[PDB]
Design an enzyme around this catalytic site. Structure first.
Site, PDB file in Angstrom:
ATOM      1  CB  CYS A 227      -1.189  -0.297   0.919  1.00  0.00           C
ATOM      2  SG  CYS A 227      -1.694   1.288   1.466  1.00  0.00           S
TER       3      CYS A 227
ATOM      4  CB  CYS B 121      -0.290   2.090   3.816  1.00  0.00           C
ATOM      5  SG  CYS B 121      -1.889   1.611   3.461  1.00  0.00           S
ATOM      6  CG  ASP B 122       3.853   1.059   4.446  1.00  0.00           C
ATOM      7  OD1 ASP B 122       3.192   1.730   5.640  1.00  0.00           O
ATOM      8  OD2 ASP B 122       3.502   0.027   4.366  1.00  0.00           O
TER       9      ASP B 122
END
Ligand SMILES: Cc1cc2nc3c(=O)[nH]c(=O)nc-3n(C[C@H](O)[C@H](O)[C@H](O)COP(=O)(O)OP(=O)(O)OC[C@H]3O[C@@H](n4cnc5c(N)ncnc54)[C@H](O)[C@@H]3O)c2cc1C
Ligand SMILES: Cc1cc2nc3c(=O)[nH]c(=O)nc-3n(C[C@H](O)[C@H](O)[C@H](O)COP(=O)(O)OP(=O)(O)OC[C@H]3O[C@@H](n4cnc5c(N)ncnc54)[C@H](O)[C@@H]3O)c2cc1C
Lengths: 316, 316
Positions: free
Chosen positions: A135, A138-139
């Site tokens: 993701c 996300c990261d």
């Protein structure tokens, strides 16, 4: 076998299932939640989370899900460890067959998710949560001003590479084919970033290995081209495997309207937004969302599903 | 006066504004957030919160908002204390006039809320957060198996009374008129609960006073009828003032499509769900949601707005 009836039944123990359980329990509905095989959902497969709002420091995916479990059980949510393998949603009450028994209910909230697929390489397995991610939203901020690699050939992969080019110093898009299976507007923007900037394309390459040190990923070894075993080596800080998600909806085929395996909901601004094509059946989380795919949006639709379920159960 | 330009500007410092700020900042967009007069939003007007998922114990509205502020500033969100009084959304860049200057931006996220109105009584002022509430979904579970009073005559009041009758032992609906200004399906369900149960109607009454002890509300004093000063006294544990909300959108009249003052968004399951009628302008939170009105649904649409804004700003 046993057959347990519930006014409200929730399927899934990810952020959507647990938030629907705390909102249903505080509505005095006495919800029953069935966990599935993956107790705690997709977030138990990741390490640090720093986009769950109001938790600036020290949060991990397992810790959030432990707290969500606590919250649901505080309000006496009945939690059953089982997995559903067959469903009948065309008669009332709905009948759901699990491994440890049968369940009937008057309203159903489906929050079964859309799990990420990986490449299956042992070196990839080794660096999960410490350099290999599925993701980018996300990261991606952990790899700010650094080199990054994305592997995949569909829509998701071009989307992840595009999002990442505004964060990372450079993005290396890796694919087996000599072209991308993506949308028209996505490939226009991709080729603009390839020519006037940030994205380095690597078609007709496969991923052989993920290399790194004790702290994480430092490289990626590629191979092949159109007729030759060339082998490239890339210096990179993170790998984003973007080969697709698997909505957990095979059990619902022929019962509910699906759209590329994702459960279609009513949506809209006039209420009853999480209702599927069957009255009384609602959906929340990543199983009905292929665009945002966040824990906060899954908890938001989990809440909407419990309140829609309450309104349904009371004749509104 | 000053004129500051920003790629992304966020209006509002409630859960929707702050979550959009942490998602925009982690997308490297360097967001500027303008707080408004009510720094921290509507949640700073309440005491305990126990439906923010993953926070089972000890949370208050002020503490959540303090943490959200921390989260946004951790990612270097530029926070300006100002309030917008005039807007031009028909030219590019958008121009917004505040008290301390002018702001232009390429994309705008509106998260200005929909504030609750109260009766204006000093005895009501006294018991706020300790027996007087404006959200039944939020606080109704604290009054489980107890007597409760709701005051109002519109849709919201009948909805709150209806939701509360499944939690409370009995619900007392108070109104000045001899009838409710509500929906057809709502009044059918109301009259069913009046005849076969839980809801005691109190038409042609006004609220004179909220009585209570050191711990909170214990009663409510009513007066009048159709020609007579009757005066009733009611023993109750909580009062839910349900006379309506005020979407903060007067500044947008004639610029964006509104629906009873709420900003109309595209919604849907195919992305760009928070976009208003103008491309580049997005909305999140209670300003675009008159159905669920929760901090978790406001944070969920805040996240969607930041990701929609990022996709817009990058030509998708
Ligand atoms: C590598 C990675 C990192 C991520 N990091 C973040 C992050 O930092 N922040 C963020 O906001 N999001 C993050 N996400 C996204 C986040 O994990 C998902 O958005 C979220 O978990 C979805 O919640 P959900 O409740 O819809 O489903 P899931 O969490 O996927 O849970 C689905 C649940 O349904 C159950 N289930 C499935 N089938 C059945 C069945 N037949 N019967 C019964 N139960 C069943 C499963 O056992 C599981 O409990 C990340 C995702 C991945 C993969
Ligand atoms: C009594 C009460 C108790 C509640 N309890 C709970 C609870 O326990 N749990 C829960 O989930 N929800 C609860 N809620 C609902 C919750 O408060 C709201 O859903 C949530 O705060 C909405 O978030 P928001 O960001 O959309 O807007 P708000 O929090 O309303 O914030 C709006 C922001 O916009 C700013 N603004 C307004 N106009 C302008 C302008 N012209 N220029 C610039 N900025 C501007 C304001 O200053 C403010 O910062 C409660 C509400 C009330 C009233």
């Amino acid at each position: 076998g046993t057959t347990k009836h519930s006014k409200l039944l929730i399927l899934g123990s990810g952020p959507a299932g647990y938030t629907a359980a705390v909102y249903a329990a505080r509505a005095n509905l006495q919800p029953v939640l069935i966990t599935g095989m993956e107790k705690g959902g997709q977030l138990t497969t990741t390490t640090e989370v720093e986009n769950w709002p109001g938790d600036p420091n020290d949060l991990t995916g397992p810790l959030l899900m432990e707290r969500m479990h606590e919250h649901a059980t505080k309000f006496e949510t009945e939690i059953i460890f089982d997995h559903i393998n067959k469903v009948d949603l065309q008669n009332r009450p709905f009948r759901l067959n699990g491994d440890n028994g049968e369940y009937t209910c008057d309203a159903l909230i489906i929050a079964t998710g859309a799990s990420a697929r990986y490449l299956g390489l042992p070196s990839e397995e080794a660096f999960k949560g410490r350099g290999v991610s599925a993701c980018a939203t996300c990261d991606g901020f952990f790899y700010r001003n650094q080199k990054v690699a994305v592997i995949g050939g569909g829509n998701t992969a071009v989307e992840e590479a595009l999002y990442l080019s505004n964060i990372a110093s450079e993005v290396h898009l890796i694919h087996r084919r000599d072209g991308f299976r993506a949308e028209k507007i996505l490939i226009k923007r991709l080729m603009d970033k390839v020519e006037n900037g940030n994205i380095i394309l690597h078609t007709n390459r496969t991923l052989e290995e993920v290399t790194g040190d004790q702290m994480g990923v430092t490289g990626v070894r590629l191979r092949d081209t159109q007729n030759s075993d060339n082998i490239e080596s890339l210096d990179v800080a993170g790998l984003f495997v973007a080969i697709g998600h698997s909505p957990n909806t095979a059990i619902f085929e022929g019962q509910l309207e699906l759209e590329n395996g994702y459960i279609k909901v009513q949506s809209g601004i006039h209420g009853n937004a999480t209702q599927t094509s069957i009255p009384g059946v609602f959906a929340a989380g990543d199983v009905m969302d292929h665009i945002y795919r966040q824990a906060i949006t899954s908890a938001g639709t989990g809440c909407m599903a419990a309140l829609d379920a309450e309104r349904y159960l009371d004749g509104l």
